[PDB]
Amino acid sequence: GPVCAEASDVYSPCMIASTPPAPFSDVTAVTFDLINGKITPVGDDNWNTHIYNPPIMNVLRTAAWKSGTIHVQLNVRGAGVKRADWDGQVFVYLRQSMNPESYDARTFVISQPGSAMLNFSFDIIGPNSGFEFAESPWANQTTWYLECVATNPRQIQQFEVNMRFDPNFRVAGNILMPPFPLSTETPPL
Amino acid sequence: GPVCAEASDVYSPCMIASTPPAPFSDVTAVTFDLINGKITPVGDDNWNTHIYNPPIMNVLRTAAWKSGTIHVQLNVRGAGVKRADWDGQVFVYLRQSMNPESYDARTFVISQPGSAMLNFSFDIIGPNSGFEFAESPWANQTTWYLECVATNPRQIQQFEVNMRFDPNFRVAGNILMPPFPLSTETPPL
Amino acid sequence: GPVCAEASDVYSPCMIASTPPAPFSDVTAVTFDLINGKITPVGDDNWNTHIYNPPIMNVLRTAAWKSGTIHVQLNVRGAGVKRADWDGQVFVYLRQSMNPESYDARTFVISQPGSAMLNFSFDIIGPNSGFEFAESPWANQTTWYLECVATNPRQIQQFEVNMRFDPNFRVAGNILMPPFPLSTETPPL
Amino acid sequence: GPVCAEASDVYSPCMIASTPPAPFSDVTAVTFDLINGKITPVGDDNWNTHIYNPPIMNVLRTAAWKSGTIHVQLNVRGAGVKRADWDGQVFVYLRQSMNPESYDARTFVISQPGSAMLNFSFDIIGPNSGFEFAESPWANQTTWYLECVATNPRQIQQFEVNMRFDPNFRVAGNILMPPFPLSTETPPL
Amino acid sequence: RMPLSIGGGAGATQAFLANMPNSWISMWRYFRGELHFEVTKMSSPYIKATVTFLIAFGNLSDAFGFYESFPHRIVQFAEVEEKCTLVFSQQEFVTAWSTQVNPRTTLEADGCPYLYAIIHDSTTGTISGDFNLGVKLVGIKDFCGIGSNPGIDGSRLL
Amino acid sequence: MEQNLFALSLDDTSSVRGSLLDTKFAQTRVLLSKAMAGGDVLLDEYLYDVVNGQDFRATVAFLRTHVITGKIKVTATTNISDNSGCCLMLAINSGVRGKYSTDVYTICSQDSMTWNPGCKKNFSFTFNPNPCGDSWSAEMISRSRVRMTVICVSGWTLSPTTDVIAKLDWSIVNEKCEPTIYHLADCQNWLPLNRWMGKLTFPQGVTSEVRRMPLSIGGGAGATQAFLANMPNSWISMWRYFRGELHFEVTKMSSPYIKATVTFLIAFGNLSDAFGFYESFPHRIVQFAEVEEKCTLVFSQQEFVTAWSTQVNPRTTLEADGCPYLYAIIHDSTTGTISGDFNLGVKLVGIKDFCGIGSNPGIDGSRLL
Amino acid sequence: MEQNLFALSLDDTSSVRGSLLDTKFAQTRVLLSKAMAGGDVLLDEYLYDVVNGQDFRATVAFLRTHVITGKIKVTATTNISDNSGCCLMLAINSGVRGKYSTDVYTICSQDSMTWNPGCKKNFSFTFNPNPCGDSWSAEMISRSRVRMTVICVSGWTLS
C-alpha cells in the first residue's frame, strides 16, 4: 500500500501539454514523439505542445546516433472534481511510428485521479554500429513515441513527459539543427 | 502507495477483446487460450477475438515444443462511469484445460476501474525432453490458458493480453501451419 | 502504486467458501483450519466448506510430520455493489487453536472491494525431531488456522484459500486416512 | 498496485484498544507507550487499554536494559460506513516522551478505511554499555511511544499495536515487577 | 493390461485414497524413472502361469497377433519360487508419461508405455483354481520429476 | 528346455545397426507428373500412420525393439534421360495445427533437403524427427501427428516421357544426430533456421534481365493477402534488423540445354535492373551445366558490416530503400535452342556469426517473399 | 542422396545372431488334454507351410536374409501345479511318403528330445533341419515337406 519511503535519483523532462476546450468534442488522445524532432500528434490537437528546451533533452532532440538508458514517465493534472465526481483513466502505448498498420511496442495502466504518474525504461539500442535513428534511410528505421490517451477531457487538464539520461548512454548526434531558442517557464501557482 | 518509479523491460502481446452487447445478458467471463491455436472461449462469446499476429507471439501460436519464460499480463478498458458510478472486479484463474472436472492452476486479484493490469510469469517446462505441448498424444498433456472474468459487462469494455519471450526460452515448434495473415491495427484514439 | 509488473512462481490452493444467506443475521467471520483435517469453523456456518482435494494440499491434509515453507493467501468475491455502494474489510488472525483463552499468532489488512487478496508465509517447523502436528499428544501441540473475518455478508460473497509447497519442505505424514474422494470443479463463468 | 504476494516472517503484538463513545466529543488521539510499563495516554481516554500479556512483549514490558530490533505496526477497525460514507485518516508520530516541549521522533501516513496498517522498525540502542531505558536517572533518558491519532471516532473503532523481537536483540531486563496476570482473549467473531 | 500411471493414492466406489507412495511422489506432472515392482506367487505351486512385465503401449487391446512383442521380462512360477520384482529404465523409456490422469483420460488416444501384461503359457490347476500377480515400487534408478499438476483427481480404478 | 531365459537373449531393446537395408522397411512410389500446377506435391503422408504392415529387413522394431537413436535416412532412385532438370523438396516439420499448408516454404523447413528429377542418380536426406536431442520410441510424431512430402517449385521446364513416380526408401542410419536450437542471445557464430527463398522463372531469348529482390528476412511469407510464419523466420528475428554472413544455395532446377549466368550478392535494392553496367557490385555467380547445378553462396562483413531490417511494413520503399542485399543481374545471353525459360535457387542453413538484437514491436505485411 | 549403395549396407545376407528373441518369430499354443487316447498329439504342422505372416523380432529373414547356420531352437513355458508328471515328444524327421504315421517311435527320431508336462518350468530342443551338415536357405524341408509335433506316451496318470 502506501509505504512510500526512500525514493531517489535525478530527473529531467521535456515539454508539457493538456487535454483541451469546452467548447470541445468526443474522446481523443495525445499521440506525440518519444524523444526528438517532430514532437506533436494529429487531428484536433490544439493541446498546445508547450515545448520546453530540457538539458539531457534537446540533447535527445539533437541526438542522431542514440545509445543510452532513459526512464520515461508520465503523470496527469485535473481539477476540483471530487474523487466521486471523477473517473480518469489512460493506458500508455509507446511504439516506433503508430498507424492503421503498425502495432504499438508497449502499454501502461492507470484509471484514477489527476496526478497519476508512471516511470520506466526503454533499452535504447540501434542498428548500424549498434545505435539507431528517426527513420533514417540506411536499411530502414522507426523511432520512439508514446500514445498518451484522452478518453475524457473534462477529467484531465494536463499531461506530463520526463526523460532520464542514464550511464549506459553511448550517445552521438549533433543533428542538422533549426530552432532551439526558449520557452522555459511561466510559474502560476 | 504510488512511488511508481523506475519500471523497465520489453513487451509484446497477442490479440485484444471486450466485455459485450447492450442488448446483452447475465454475468459471464472470457475463457480463452493462454499461448496458441484455438484461442477463443465458449457459449455467448461475440466478444470478437480480434486476433493480432504478434512477433514472439504467433511464434507462441507456432511453437510446438515450448521451453521458455513468459510474463503474461492483463489490463482492462471501461468508460465514463464515475469512480463511484463504478465496480469492476475480475480474478484471474489460468490453468491447463478448464472444466466441470479440472482445477485451475492459478488465480489473481483486482475489483476496481478500467485500466487495471496484472503481470507475472509461468515457468514453462515440458515432458519429453523437458519440453511440452497442446494435449499432444505422447503420454498425455494439457496447456496454457487463463480465465479472464466478466461479472459485469456494463463495467468493462476491453480485455488485454500480453506475452514475454524470456532468456530461459529453449524453444522449438514449426507446427503444421494454416492461416497467419494479418489483422494488425485500427487506430481510433 | 500500480507498477504491477513481473509477478511469478507456482500456486495451488485448498477449498473455497462464502459469506452467507439473505435471510441471514449479525456480523460473524469464518474461522476454519489452516492446513488439514477438521477444516470448518463454529456456530452459524452454512457457508458450505466446498472442500477441494488439492495436490500439495490433501498432501497437507495428509501430512502428519510437517516441515516446509508455504505461502498462504486469501482473496475475496462480492458483487455489483458500486465502489461507493461498498465497504468490505477483513483482517486476518491466523493462529494455532483460537479461543476465549489463546492469543492469535498473526493478523492482516484490507477493508476494500471484492477481489482483495493477501499472500505470505508461516515458517513451518516442529518439535520432536524439529517437525510437528495437530495437537498430537507427545509433550503437546497446536496447529495452523486462520481467522478469515465476516463483518458484513452483503459485502462479500466468497473467501479464497491457497497453499505453497516450498523447497524447505522436509515432509512426512501418511496419516491414518478416511475420505479423499472428490469435489473438484463446477465452472459457472 | 495490488501484486500482494510472497509476504512473510513471525509476529507478536501487545494490547488492543478503540476510538470511543457516542455520547462522546471533539477529535482527540491515543497517545500511549511504545514498549513497557505505563502504557496509557492522557485526558479523555476511556478507550480501555485492553492490555494483553504478549510473549516477546511483557518481555518488552519487563526489559530494562533493552537492545534489539522491533517491527512495530498499526492497523485499524471501523464499521459498515460505506467507502463513501467514510474518511479515516491517521498519521503516526512515535517519539520518546511527547509534550508542549519535545519534538516527536517519527511520523506515518494513511487516511482511508478501517483495516489500514503500517509496519516498520526503530533501531533500538542505548547509552550505558550501548543499551538504554525508561528515563532511568543515569545521565538521563527518554523512551518509546507512539502517537496513534483520532481525528474522527465515528470513523474508527479500534487501534492495533504489534512488536517484533528480532536477532539484533542483545536484551536484558528483569525489572522490578508488579502485575503480570492475564487478560488474554474474548473471541466475538 | 493395466497402466503404470502413478499419483496420490486410489479409488473406492466414487471415493479415493491419498498415501505416502503417491502424492509428494508427484506434485510435478508426468513421472520419469526406472522404478520396478515386486510380483509374487500369492497363487499356486499347483497352478502356474507365465506373464511378461514391462513397457509397450496401453492403447493395444489384449488380443494382439503375437502379444509377446515388447522388450520382455516374466513369470514361470514354483511350489518354492514366488516373490519377484522388476526393473524398467531409460535404455527403455527415456521419455515422459503422466503421474496423474482425469476421469475421462483415454486409450484410443492413450499417451505413453507402461506395464500392461500378457501371459504366455496355458494356465492351470488340475483342480478348481485361478492365478494372480503382484506389483510394487520401493526405489527407482534416478527419477525425473518436474512440472506440476494444478489439479484433477479421478483416482484411476487403480 | 528349462531356463530363466526371461532375460537371456530375449528382452529385445536394440537401438538397431541394421545395414541401411537390414534397416530398410518402406515401399511407396514417389509421384511424378507433366500436366502440372507449378508446385506439385507428390504426396504428404505420416510417420506411423504412413502404413501399418510393411514386410522388410528391419521389421518387428518399427514397434518392438523400443528405442534407437540414428537418423531416419532416405535415397529415392529416380532420373529420366538428358533434356532438362528440375526442383523437388521433401516435407518434414512438426505435428500440425488445423487445415494447415503445403509448400516448399512450408512443408520441409523443420529439417530439409533440395533435389533435381534428373541428376545423375539420387538425393539424400537423413530424417531424425526429434530436434530436442536424439534417441526415440514409436511415439513423438505419431501422437505428435507430423506428415511428410515431396515436390518441385521450379520443374523441368521441358515436360518429358511419362509420370515416373520412383521409390521412397528409409528406416535410419548410425549418425550423430545434431540437436538443433537457436540462441536468444542473438549475435552468434553459425545459424540454424534454413529460410526458403529460391527460384526465378527466366524467359528464353535474352530479355535484358536482372530480377532484383531483397534479402529482408522475417516470420515466414504471403499468399493472396494471407501469410506464413515458419522455423527459418520468426525466433530468427524478434530482434529488429538482422546482421550476419548467411548464404544461400542456388541450383540448376532449369537446364543443361538452357543456361544463364547470374551474379549473387549485396549492392542496393533502390537501383532498377536497367543500370549502365549492372555487373558493378562485388560479384559471385552462375555458369550452369548438364552436370553442375547446385550452388550455394557466402556474403559477410568485409562486405556489409552494417544493419538492415529482418522485418518490413506493407508500405516499405525503394525510392527511399534502406540497405544492400541480393538483387541479381544476368550476364550471359540466355538460351534453350528450343522452347524454354531459366531459374535460380536461394536458401539459409548456417551464417558466420550473426548479430541479432533490438526487437520489432510489430507489423507484418509478409513481403511478396 | 546419390550413392552406388547398391552394395553399401544393403545386400542383406546375414546368417543372423539375433538374441534368441531378436530371433524369435513363432506363436502357437501347444495343445494339452485329459479325456485322452494314450498317445496324444498336440499337433503336427510344417516348417514353411507352418504359417505365412508372423510379426516377430527376427522378421523379414524367414524368407529374406538368404542363409544362416545355427539350430532352430525351442522352449515352451508350461507346468500345472504338483500332483503328477507325464511324457511328451516333438516330431521332427524327413519330408514324407504318403498317408504316413504319427507316433513317438515315429515322428521325432530324426532328431529329438523327451519332456514332462509339469517339470519345474520348461524343455529344450534346438532343431537344425539339415543333418547333411549345417547352413540353410528357405527350402530344404519345404520342398522337402517335413511336419513336426508334440505328444505324450505315458501321461500324468492323474488327469
PDB file of N, CA, C and O in Angstrom, chain F residues 1-3 5 9-10 12-14 17 19-22 55-57 59-60 64-65 74-75 120 122-124, chain G residues 1-3 5 9-10 12-14 17 19-22 55-57 59-60 64-65 75 120 122-124:
ATOM      1  N   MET F   1      14.924 -76.161 -23.444  1.00  0.00           N
ATOM      2  CA  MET F   1      14.365 -76.674 -22.133  1.00  0.00           C
ATOM      3  C   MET F   1      14.221 -75.566 -21.100  1.00  0.00           C
ATOM      4  O   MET F   1      13.933 -74.421 -21.480  1.00  0.00           O
ATOM      5  N   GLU F   2      14.339 -75.952 -19.818  1.00  0.00           N
ATOM      6  CA  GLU F   2      14.239 -75.048 -18.674  1.00  0.00           C
ATOM      7  C   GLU F   2      15.364 -74.017 -18.792  1.00  0.00           C
ATOM      8  O   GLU F   2      16.449 -74.334 -19.337  1.00  0.00           O
ATOM      9  N   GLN F   3      15.063 -72.793 -18.329  1.00  0.00           N
ATOM     10  CA  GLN F   3      15.962 -71.619 -18.317  1.00  0.00           C
ATOM     11  C   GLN F   3      15.154 -70.356 -17.987  1.00  0.00           C
ATOM     12  O   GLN F   3      14.035 -70.155 -18.511  1.00  0.00           O
ATOM     13  N   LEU F   5      15.446 -67.760 -19.093  1.00  0.00           N
ATOM     14  CA  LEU F   5      15.753 -67.058 -20.305  1.00  0.00           C
ATOM     15  C   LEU F   5      14.884 -65.841 -20.420  1.00  0.00           C
ATOM     16  O   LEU F   5      14.959 -65.081 -21.399  1.00  0.00           O
ATOM     17  N   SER F   9      18.697 -63.763 -23.926  1.00  0.00           N
ATOM     18  CA  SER F   9      18.875 -63.062 -25.211  1.00  0.00           C
ATOM     19  C   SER F   9      17.434 -62.907 -25.696  1.00  0.00           C
ATOM     20  O   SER F   9      16.989 -63.403 -26.756  1.00  0.00           O
ATOM     21  N   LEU F  10      16.667 -62.263 -24.838  1.00  0.00           N
ATOM     22  CA  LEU F  10      15.285 -62.130 -25.133  1.00  0.00           C
ATOM     23  C   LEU F  10      14.673 -60.771 -24.902  1.00  0.00           C
ATOM     24  O   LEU F  10      13.855 -60.367 -25.693  1.00  0.00           O
ATOM     25  N   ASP F  12      14.713 -57.928 -25.899  1.00  0.00           N
ATOM     26  CA  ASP F  12      14.760 -57.041 -27.056  1.00  0.00           C
ATOM     27  C   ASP F  12      14.511 -55.542 -27.045  1.00  0.00           C
ATOM     28  O   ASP F  12      13.406 -55.125 -27.369  1.00  0.00           O
ATOM     29  N   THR F  13      15.627 -54.798 -26.865  1.00  0.00           N
ATOM     30  CA  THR F  13      15.756 -53.309 -26.798  1.00  0.00           C
ATOM     31  C   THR F  13      16.330 -52.627 -28.082  1.00  0.00           C
ATOM     32  O   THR F  13      15.879 -51.583 -28.550  1.00  0.00           O
ATOM     33  N   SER F  14      17.471 -53.162 -28.461  1.00  0.00           N
ATOM     34  CA  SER F  14      18.272 -52.774 -29.582  1.00  0.00           C
ATOM     35  C   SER F  14      18.021 -51.545 -30.351  1.00  0.00           C
ATOM     36  O   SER F  14      17.059 -51.447 -31.050  1.00  0.00           O
ATOM     37  N   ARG F  17      21.587 -51.207 -35.572  1.00  0.00           N
ATOM     38  CA  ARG F  17      22.609 -51.022 -36.635  1.00  0.00           C
ATOM     39  C   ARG F  17      22.406 -52.022 -37.779  1.00  0.00           C
ATOM     40  O   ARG F  17      23.330 -52.725 -38.247  1.00  0.00           O
ATOM     41  N   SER F  19      21.982 -53.028 -41.532  1.00  0.00           N
ATOM     42  CA  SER F  19      22.644 -52.409 -42.674  1.00  0.00           C
ATOM     43  C   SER F  19      21.552 -51.551 -43.113  1.00  0.00           C
ATOM     44  O   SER F  19      20.382 -51.936 -42.960  1.00  0.00           O
ATOM     45  N   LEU F  20      21.890 -50.378 -43.621  1.00  0.00           N
ATOM     46  CA  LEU F  20      20.831 -49.496 -44.051  1.00  0.00           C
ATOM     47  C   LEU F  20      19.702 -50.185 -44.854  1.00  0.00           C
ATOM     48  O   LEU F  20      18.728 -49.512 -45.175  1.00  0.00           O
ATOM     49  N   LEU F  21      19.845 -51.489 -45.185  1.00  0.00           N
ATOM     50  CA  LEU F  21      18.773 -52.274 -45.821  1.00  0.00           C
ATOM     51  C   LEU F  21      18.296 -53.295 -44.763  1.00  0.00           C
ATOM     52  O   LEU F  21      17.105 -53.546 -44.671  1.00  0.00           O
ATOM     53  N   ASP F  22      19.188 -53.784 -43.889  1.00  0.00           N
ATOM     54  CA  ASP F  22      18.787 -54.715 -42.823  1.00  0.00           C
ATOM     55  C   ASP F  22      18.033 -53.746 -41.881  1.00  0.00           C
ATOM     56  O   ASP F  22      17.657 -54.045 -40.753  1.00  0.00           O
ATOM     57  N   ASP F  55       6.432 -55.535 -44.860  1.00  0.00           N
ATOM     58  CA  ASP F  55       7.393 -56.642 -44.909  1.00  0.00           C
ATOM     59  C   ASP F  55       8.816 -56.302 -45.370  1.00  0.00           C
ATOM     60  O   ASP F  55       9.128 -56.337 -46.568  1.00  0.00           O
ATOM     61  N   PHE F  56       9.691 -55.915 -44.447  1.00  0.00           N
ATOM     62  CA  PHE F  56      11.053 -55.596 -44.901  1.00  0.00           C
ATOM     63  C   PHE F  56      12.204 -56.057 -43.999  1.00  0.00           C
ATOM     64  O   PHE F  56      11.949 -56.838 -43.056  1.00  0.00           O
ATOM     65  N   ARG F  57      13.450 -55.613 -44.260  1.00  0.00           N
ATOM     66  CA  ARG F  57      14.591 -56.137 -43.471  1.00  0.00           C
ATOM     67  C   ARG F  57      14.557 -55.817 -42.002  1.00  0.00           C
ATOM     68  O   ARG F  57      14.854 -56.682 -41.220  1.00  0.00           O
ATOM     69  N   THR F  59      12.235 -55.283 -39.301  1.00  0.00           N
ATOM     70  CA  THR F  59      10.801 -55.458 -39.321  1.00  0.00           C
ATOM     71  C   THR F  59      10.017 -55.241 -38.038  1.00  0.00           C
ATOM     72  O   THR F  59       9.311 -54.221 -37.904  1.00  0.00           O
ATOM     73  N   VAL F  60      10.182 -56.136 -37.072  1.00  0.00           N
ATOM     74  CA  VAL F  60       9.424 -56.022 -35.847  1.00  0.00           C
ATOM     75  C   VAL F  60       9.675 -54.758 -35.024  1.00  0.00           C
ATOM     76  O   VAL F  60       8.731 -54.202 -34.465  1.00  0.00           O
ATOM     77  N   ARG F  64       8.637 -52.413 -31.672  1.00  0.00           N
ATOM     78  CA  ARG F  64       9.131 -53.585 -30.954  1.00  0.00           C
ATOM     79  C   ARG F  64      10.330 -53.234 -30.084  1.00  0.00           C
ATOM     80  O   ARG F  64      10.151 -52.798 -28.912  1.00  0.00           O
ATOM     81  N   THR F  65      11.509 -53.250 -30.737  1.00  0.00           N
ATOM     82  CA  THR F  65      12.827 -53.021 -30.132  1.00  0.00           C
ATOM     83  C   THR F  65      12.915 -52.015 -28.996  1.00  0.00           C
ATOM     84  O   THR F  65      13.692 -52.175 -28.065  1.00  0.00           O
ATOM     85  N   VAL F  74      16.911 -41.551 -46.130  1.00  0.00           N
ATOM     86  CA  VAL F  74      16.267 -41.878 -47.401  1.00  0.00           C
ATOM     87  C   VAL F  74      17.184 -41.669 -48.626  1.00  0.00           C
ATOM     88  O   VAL F  74      18.094 -40.853 -48.581  1.00  0.00           O
ATOM     89  N   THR F  75      16.898 -42.408 -49.707  1.00  0.00           N
ATOM     90  CA  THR F  75      17.539 -42.341 -51.061  1.00  0.00           C
ATOM     91  C   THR F  75      16.450 -42.899 -52.042  1.00  0.00           C
ATOM     92  O   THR F  75      15.997 -44.048 -51.923  1.00  0.00           O
ATOM     93  N   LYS F 120      22.049 -37.233 -62.283  1.00  0.00           N
ATOM     94  CA  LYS F 120      22.943 -38.371 -62.185  1.00  0.00           C
ATOM     95  C   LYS F 120      22.272 -39.618 -61.655  1.00  0.00           C
ATOM     96  O   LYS F 120      22.105 -40.555 -62.395  1.00  0.00           O
ATOM     97  N   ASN F 122      20.569 -40.053 -57.716  1.00  0.00           N
ATOM     98  CA  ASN F 122      19.727 -39.855 -56.449  1.00  0.00           C
ATOM     99  C   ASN F 122      20.059 -38.759 -55.345  1.00  0.00           C
ATOM    100  O   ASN F 122      21.212 -38.276 -55.175  1.00  0.00           O
ATOM    101  N   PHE F 123      19.039 -38.360 -54.575  1.00  0.00           N
ATOM    102  CA  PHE F 123      19.290 -37.445 -53.448  1.00  0.00           C
ATOM    103  C   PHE F 123      19.197 -38.152 -52.059  1.00  0.00           C
ATOM    104  O   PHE F 123      18.604 -39.241 -51.921  1.00  0.00           O
ATOM    105  N   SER F 124      19.895 -37.548 -51.082  1.00  0.00           N
ATOM    106  CA  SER F 124      19.968 -37.975 -49.669  1.00  0.00           C
ATOM    107  C   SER F 124      19.308 -36.953 -48.703  1.00  0.00           C
ATOM    108  O   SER F 124      19.379 -35.742 -48.895  1.00  0.00           O
TER     109      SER F 124
ATOM    110  N   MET G   1      20.998 -39.246 -50.582  1.00  0.00           N
ATOM    111  CA  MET G   1      21.243 -38.756 -51.994  1.00  0.00           C
ATOM    112  C   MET G   1      21.871 -39.829 -52.871  1.00  0.00           C
ATOM    113  O   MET G   1      21.568 -41.018 -52.681  1.00  0.00           O
ATOM    114  N   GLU G   2      22.660 -39.378 -53.861  1.00  0.00           N
ATOM    115  CA  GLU G   2      23.361 -40.238 -54.811  1.00  0.00           C
ATOM    116  C   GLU G   2      24.331 -41.119 -54.019  1.00  0.00           C
ATOM    117  O   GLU G   2      24.846 -40.687 -52.959  1.00  0.00           O
ATOM    118  N   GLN G   3      24.517 -42.350 -54.519  1.00  0.00           N
ATOM    119  CA  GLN G   3      25.399 -43.396 -53.957  1.00  0.00           C
ATOM    120  C   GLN G   3      25.106 -44.739 -54.642  1.00  0.00           C
ATOM    121  O   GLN G   3      23.929 -45.106 -54.858  1.00  0.00           O
ATOM    122  N   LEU G   5      25.036 -47.319 -53.465  1.00  0.00           N
ATOM    123  CA  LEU G   5      24.670 -48.025 -52.272  1.00  0.00           C
ATOM    124  C   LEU G   5      24.063 -49.348 -52.632  1.00  0.00           C
ATOM    125  O   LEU G   5      23.654 -50.133 -51.760  1.00  0.00           O
ATOM    126  N   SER G   9      25.363 -51.058 -47.480  1.00  0.00           N
ATOM    127  CA  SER G   9      24.851 -51.783 -46.303  1.00  0.00           C
ATOM    128  C   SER G   9      23.431 -52.144 -46.738  1.00  0.00           C
ATOM    129  O   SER G   9      22.394 -51.756 -46.156  1.00  0.00           O
ATOM    130  N   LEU G  10      23.397 -52.846 -47.854  1.00  0.00           N
ATOM    131  CA  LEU G  10      22.132 -53.170 -48.412  1.00  0.00           C
ATOM    132  C   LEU G  10      21.951 -54.586 -48.898  1.00  0.00           C
ATOM    133  O   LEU G  10      20.887 -55.126 -48.712  1.00  0.00           O
ATOM    134  N   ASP G  12      21.773 -57.439 -47.945  1.00  0.00           N
ATOM    135  CA  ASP G  12      21.255 -58.360 -46.939  1.00  0.00           C
ATOM    136  C   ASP G  12      21.255 -59.877 -47.031  1.00  0.00           C
ATOM    137  O   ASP G  12      20.234 -60.447 -47.391  1.00  0.00           O
ATOM    138  N   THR G  13      22.354 -60.461 -46.498  1.00  0.00           N
ATOM    139  CA  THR G  13      22.690 -61.916 -46.415  1.00  0.00           C
ATOM    140  C   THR G  13      22.495 -62.571 -45.009  1.00  0.00           C
ATOM    141  O   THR G  13      21.997 -63.684 -44.847  1.00  0.00           O
ATOM    142  N   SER G  14      23.123 -61.908 -44.061  1.00  0.00           N
ATOM    143  CA  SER G  14      23.165 -62.236 -42.668  1.00  0.00           C
ATOM    144  C   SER G  14      22.677 -63.518 -42.137  1.00  0.00           C
ATOM    145  O   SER G  14      21.511 -63.771 -42.124  1.00  0.00           O
ATOM    146  N   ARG G  17      22.556 -63.608 -35.807  1.00  0.00           N
ATOM    147  CA  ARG G  17      22.784 -63.702 -34.341  1.00  0.00           C
ATOM    148  C   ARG G  17      21.827 -62.787 -33.571  1.00  0.00           C
ATOM    149  O   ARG G  17      22.207 -61.990 -32.684  1.00  0.00           O
ATOM    150  N   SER G  19      19.177 -62.002 -30.807  1.00  0.00           N
ATOM    151  CA  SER G  19      19.127 -62.577 -29.469  1.00  0.00           C
ATOM    152  C   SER G  19      18.106 -63.588 -29.710  1.00  0.00           C
ATOM    153  O   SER G  19      17.204 -63.352 -30.530  1.00  0.00           O
ATOM    154  N   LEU G  20      18.235 -64.726 -29.052  1.00  0.00           N
ATOM    155  CA  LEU G  20      17.249 -65.756 -29.280  1.00  0.00           C
ATOM    156  C   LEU G  20      15.786 -65.254 -29.311  1.00  0.00           C
ATOM    157  O   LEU G  20      14.904 -66.061 -29.588  1.00  0.00           O
ATOM    158  N   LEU G  21      15.539 -63.957 -29.014  1.00  0.00           N
ATOM    159  CA  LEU G  21      14.206 -63.346 -29.152  1.00  0.00           C
ATOM    160  C   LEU G  21      14.304 -62.352 -30.332  1.00  0.00           C
ATOM    161  O   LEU G  21      13.367 -62.255 -31.108  1.00  0.00           O
ATOM    162  N   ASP G  22      15.465 -61.715 -30.545  1.00  0.00           N
ATOM    163  CA  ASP G  22      15.640 -60.800 -31.684  1.00  0.00           C
ATOM    164  C   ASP G  22      15.707 -61.818 -32.847  1.00  0.00           C
ATOM    165  O   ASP G  22      16.021 -61.525 -33.995  1.00  0.00           O
ATOM    166  N   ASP G  55       4.421 -61.680 -37.235  1.00  0.00           N
ATOM    167  CA  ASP G  55       5.021 -60.459 -36.683  1.00  0.00           C
ATOM    168  C   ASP G  55       5.941 -60.630 -35.468  1.00  0.00           C
ATOM    169  O   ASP G  55       5.492 -60.606 -34.314  1.00  0.00           O
ATOM    170  N   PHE G  56       7.230 -60.862 -35.694  1.00  0.00           N
ATOM    171  CA  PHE G  56       8.103 -61.020 -34.521  1.00  0.00           C
ATOM    172  C   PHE G  56       9.492 -60.376 -34.605  1.00  0.00           C
ATOM    173  O   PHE G  56       9.733 -59.596 -35.553  1.00  0.00           O
ATOM    174  N   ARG G  57      10.400 -60.665 -33.652  1.00  0.00           N
ATOM    175  CA  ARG G  57      11.707 -59.964 -33.652  1.00  0.00           C
ATOM    176  C   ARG G  57      12.573 -60.224 -34.853  1.00  0.00           C
ATOM    177  O   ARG G  57      13.154 -59.296 -35.353  1.00  0.00           O
ATOM    178  N   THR G  59      12.344 -60.942 -38.375  1.00  0.00           N
ATOM    179  CA  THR G  59      11.158 -60.956 -39.199  1.00  0.00           C
ATOM    180  C   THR G  59      11.301 -61.219 -40.689  1.00  0.00           C
ATOM    181  O   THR G  59      10.944 -62.316 -41.165  1.00  0.00           O
ATOM    182  N   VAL G  60      11.878 -60.271 -41.416  1.00  0.00           N
ATOM    183  CA  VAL G  60      11.995 -60.431 -42.847  1.00  0.00           C
ATOM    184  C   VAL G  60      12.839 -61.616 -43.317  1.00  0.00           C
ATOM    185  O   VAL G  60      12.477 -62.266 -44.297  1.00  0.00           O
ATOM    186  N   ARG G  64      14.255 -63.933 -46.547  1.00  0.00           N
ATOM    187  CA  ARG G  64      14.916 -62.678 -46.893  1.00  0.00           C
ATOM    188  C   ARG G  64      16.431 -62.834 -46.890  1.00  0.00           C
ATOM    189  O   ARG G  64      17.024 -63.240 -47.929  1.00  0.00           O
ATOM    190  N   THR G  65      16.998 -62.692 -45.676  1.00  0.00           N
ATOM    191  CA  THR G  65      18.438 -62.723 -45.393  1.00  0.00           C
ATOM    192  C   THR G  65      19.299 -63.660 -46.223  1.00  0.00           C
ATOM    193  O   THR G  65      20.443 -63.361 -46.536  1.00  0.00           O
ATOM    194  N   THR G  75      11.725 -73.525 -26.668  1.00  0.00           N
ATOM    195  CA  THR G  75      11.463 -73.566 -25.191  1.00  0.00           C
ATOM    196  C   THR G  75       9.945 -73.195 -25.050  1.00  0.00           C
ATOM    197  O   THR G  75       9.501 -72.112 -25.458  1.00  0.00           O
ATOM    198  N   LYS G 120       9.237 -78.509 -13.235  1.00  0.00           N
ATOM    199  CA  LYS G 120       9.864 -77.261 -12.843  1.00  0.00           C
ATOM    200  C   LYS G 120       9.471 -76.090 -13.716  1.00  0.00           C
ATOM    201  O   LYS G 120       8.785 -75.215 -13.250  1.00  0.00           O
ATOM    202  N   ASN G 122      10.333 -75.716 -17.925  1.00  0.00           N
ATOM    203  CA  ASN G 122      10.417 -75.969 -19.436  1.00  0.00           C
ATOM    204  C   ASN G 122      11.467 -76.965 -20.095  1.00  0.00           C
ATOM    205  O   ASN G 122      12.556 -77.287 -19.544  1.00  0.00           O
ATOM    206  N   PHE G 123      11.146 -77.461 -21.297  1.00  0.00           N
ATOM    207  CA  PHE G 123      12.121 -78.287 -22.029  1.00  0.00           C
ATOM    208  C   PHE G 123      12.761 -77.541 -23.243  1.00  0.00           C
ATOM    209  O   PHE G 123      12.223 -76.534 -23.745  1.00  0.00           O
ATOM    210  N   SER G 124      13.968 -78.008 -23.606  1.00  0.00           N
ATOM    211  CA  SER G 124      14.791 -77.516 -24.731  1.00  0.00           C
ATOM    212  C   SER G 124      14.954 -78.574 -25.857  1.00  0.00           C
ATOM    213  O   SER G 124      15.057 -79.772 -25.609  1.00  0.00           O
TER     214      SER G 124
END
